[PDB]
Scaffold this active site. Sequence first.
Site, PDB file in Angstrom:
ATOM      1  N   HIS B  64      29.432  22.086   4.949  1.00 54.77           N
ATOM      2  CA  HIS B  64      29.641  21.670   3.565  1.00 54.77           C
ATOM      3  C   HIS B  64      30.760  20.655   3.429  1.00 54.77           C
ATOM      4  CE1 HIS B  64      26.973  24.924   2.406  1.00 54.77           C
ATOM      5  NE2 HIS B  64      27.746  25.728   3.137  1.00 54.77           N
ATOM      6  N   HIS B 115      41.670  18.590  -0.477  1.00 53.32           N
ATOM      7  CA  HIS B 115      42.179  19.876  -0.960  1.00 53.32           C
ATOM      8  C   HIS B 115      42.913  20.571   0.161  1.00 53.32           C
ATOM      9  CE1 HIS B 115      38.767  19.901  -4.117  1.00 53.32           C
ATOM     10  NE2 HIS B 115      39.880  19.229  -4.525  1.00 53.32           N
ATOM     11  N   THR B 197      33.290  25.393  -4.761  1.00 53.61           N
ATOM     12  CA  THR B 197      32.107  25.679  -3.960  1.00 53.61           C
ATOM     13  C   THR B 197      31.800  27.139  -4.221  1.00 53.61           C
ATOM     14  OG1 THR B 197      33.401  26.381  -2.045  1.00 53.61           O
ATOM     15  CG2 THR B 197      32.880  24.086  -2.177  1.00 53.61           C
TER      16      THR B 197
HETATM   17  N1  LIG Z   1      36.989  23.103  -2.838  1.00 52.61           N
HETATM   18  S1  LIG Z   1      38.072  24.242  -3.075  1.00 52.61           S
HETATM   19  O1  LIG Z   1      37.986  24.861  -4.369  1.00 52.61           O
HETATM   20  O2  LIG Z   1      39.363  23.705  -2.715  1.00 52.61           O
HETATM   21  C1  LIG Z   1      37.766  25.519  -1.879  1.00 52.61           C
HETATM   22  C2  LIG Z   1      36.811  25.385  -0.885  1.00 52.61           C
HETATM   23  C3  LIG Z   1      36.596  26.351   0.114  1.00 52.61           C
HETATM   24  C4  LIG Z   1      35.581  26.045   1.097  1.00 52.61           C
HETATM   25  O3  LIG Z   1      35.948  25.892   2.257  1.00 52.61           O
HETATM   26  N2  LIG Z   1      34.328  25.922   0.743  1.00 52.61           N
HETATM   27  C5  LIG Z   1      33.185  25.665   1.658  1.00 52.61           C
HETATM   28  C6  LIG Z   1      32.383  26.963   1.590  1.00 52.61           C
HETATM   29  O4  LIG Z   1      31.947  27.196   2.868  1.00 52.61           O
HETATM   30  C7  LIG Z   1      37.441  27.460   0.099  1.00 52.61           C
HETATM   31  S2  LIG Z   1      37.100  28.619   1.436  1.00 52.61           S
HETATM   32  C8  LIG Z   1      37.984  30.093   0.945  1.00 52.61           C
HETATM   33  C9  LIG Z   1      39.408  29.757   1.420  1.00 52.61           C
HETATM   34  C10 LIG Z   1      40.182  31.031   1.171  1.00 52.61           C
HETATM   35  C11 LIG Z   1      39.513  32.152   2.027  1.00 52.61           C
HETATM   36  C12 LIG Z   1      38.121  32.464   1.485  1.00 52.61           C
HETATM   37  C13 LIG Z   1      37.355  31.206   1.813  1.00 52.61           C
HETATM   38  C14 LIG Z   1      38.410  27.644  -0.877  1.00 52.61           C
HETATM   39  C15 LIG Z   1      38.574  26.650  -1.821  1.00 52.61           C
HETATM   40 CL1  LIG Z   1      39.844  26.974  -2.933  1.00 52.61          CL
HETATM   41 ZN   LIG Z   2      37.520  21.482  -2.016  1.00 52.52          ZN
END
Ligand SMILES: NS(=O)(=O)c1cc(C(=O)NCCO)c(SC2CCCCC2)cc1Cl
Ligand SMILES: [Zn+2]
Lengths: 261, 261
Positions: B64, B115, B197
Amino acid sequence: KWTYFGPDGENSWSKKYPSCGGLLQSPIDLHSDILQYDASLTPLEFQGYNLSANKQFLLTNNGHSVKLNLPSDMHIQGLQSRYSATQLHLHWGNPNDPHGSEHTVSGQHFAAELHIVHYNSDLYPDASTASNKSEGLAVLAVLIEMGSFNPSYDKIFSHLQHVKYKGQEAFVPGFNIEELLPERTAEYYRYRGSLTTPPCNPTVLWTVFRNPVQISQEQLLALETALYCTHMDDPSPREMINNFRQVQKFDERLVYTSFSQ
Amino acid sequence: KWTYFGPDGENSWSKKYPSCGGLLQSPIDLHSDILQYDASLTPLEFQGYNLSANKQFLLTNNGHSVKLNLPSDMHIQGLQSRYSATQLHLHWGNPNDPHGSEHTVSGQHFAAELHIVHYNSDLYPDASTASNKSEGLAVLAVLIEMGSFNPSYDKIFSHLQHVKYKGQEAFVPGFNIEELLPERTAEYYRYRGSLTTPPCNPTVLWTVFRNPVQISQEQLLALETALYCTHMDDPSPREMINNFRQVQKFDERLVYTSFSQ
Ligand SMILES: NS(=O)(=O)c1cc(C(=O)NCCO)c(SC2CCCCC2)cc1Cl
Ligand SMILES: [Zn+2]
Ligand SMILES: NS(=O)(=O)c1cc(C(=O)NCCO)c(SC2CCCCC2)cc1Cl
Ligand SMILES: [Zn+2]
């Protein structure tokens, strides 16, 4: 069964209305990189728009917008088929963020937007039947901004107090609907898209006029504050605001313009 | 197998991931009507961001985005708890339209967005546990504009041909992650929101820096052409492009700014 907020809002429409997650969704941002002049886009003609002042037209609050029913002798000429009118309605924001058009231009919302919905009466017997079919619908969209008082829009807005709650209905005397259109209707954007509400069928030929109309500060505030999306006797009333869909992705596609200038 | 395009795209995420249809969703359009200065938004300090060049950090294509794993000794100081880094990743557009940021400013997309995800390490033993808890996560968002070549970003981008497919991993020597942040980090937007996401958990304290960074057209083109959402052996490959979510309704939120003008 659907709303513009909470858990039944637009991200959830596709559960019950699968087309809301399919192709050709509207509205979209109209911005310069995706625009292309097309000299095939000649002026439309608005026929039967001068509605008999001896006839009455039904205005409803349907819990999603305010809607005025229109007669099928009113139609657009200039497309390949005749498209006959069925209804008009509006979308708007709220007094703290009064920027509730559905289409945007170069990323910017206008205050509100008017949609005059038509169906292909040459191919289909009525709007409902047309709505899920090829070439079924055509919508004229007018962008609305704050400015001078607009008497013609007040021919609708003066009735809003009588359709405050969901299900209520008022009669509007005929007037010339073309008075709701902007200057230089020859200038427009054109693309194939969808209903912007459920069921989101990808069957709409969109015409968005280039130039906005004006309504006063008081008129815009009236539109934003006059209506509820709940029935009169609901013990938890909700104001009808922010009844626009977010813009949708639009990749590898053009919006055709009737103007280059 | 959620995606950013087609039947598994963002209007359908709520079918499988209910919080994607819930409140407090990100990203959002940052515009004047919803901004309010808050003098209590004091500067963050970035501790342990200068990663040793003699150590290496895992870069992965997760299907992704491209993500770099970060050590938990890296943290932000200045929130009400310590937030420790877990990973950074990007969102972008495509070669023919490099306009893929998630947040927009006054309706305009930036070329891309970085991010840097952190979790409340005072309260939780890991980011996954934190991701389900209110203000469990804090993300720093940097808006990226097409401009000058950026040697710091290139410490990540120079490895893209080595993580071209889902599940692939590479090592990146440590560098100073603060070099990815823009000028005047004391100037930021702050709001309560969500993962952008699936599963879209509403558990993120967002900090979006006011000022963008620049990367070049050639760096954007490498980012937009190197990666695939699919595995190396998939007979139906999909290019990893346009991996940003559309902006979300505000749901009555304001965005607080550390700058007044
Ligand atoms: N685009 S975003 O809002 O910055 C965001 C993206 C992810 C993320 O890695 N998403 C891809 C799904 O596989 C994650 S992964 C999340 C990271 C903390 C542990 C649980 C997985 C977290 C955020 Cl905040
Ligand atoms: Zn992100
Ligand atoms: N916002 S829009 O794309 O112009 C649009 C909206 C509606 C509409 O009235 N939606 C609200 C209640 O379902 C309709 S209602 C539709 C037309 C009458 C026959 C089938 C329903 C049609 C369109 Cl194109
Ligand atoms: Zn409409």
